[PDB]
Amino acid sequence: RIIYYIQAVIPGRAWLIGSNGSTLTVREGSKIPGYGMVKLIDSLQGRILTSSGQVIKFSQEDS
């Protein structure tokens, strides 16, 4: 699949960057390819839990 790290996260939206260079943004419920749809966004920790169990987390080389 395409693995996505986040570039910005605030209460509500979160701006995500994938490995293809594509930039997107998500909310409490939004369809994300492969990862399902977002279950919740935690801006304080910088996590997003999705339906597929996949956790979206600030890129290892930028967090």
Binding site: P11, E28, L40, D42, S43, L44, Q45
Partner: peptide, 9 residues
């Protein structure tokens, strides 16, 4: 809808 900073364990 949920503001996590208003969070409590």
């Amino acid at each position: 809808c949920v503001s996590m900073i208003g969070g409590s364990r």
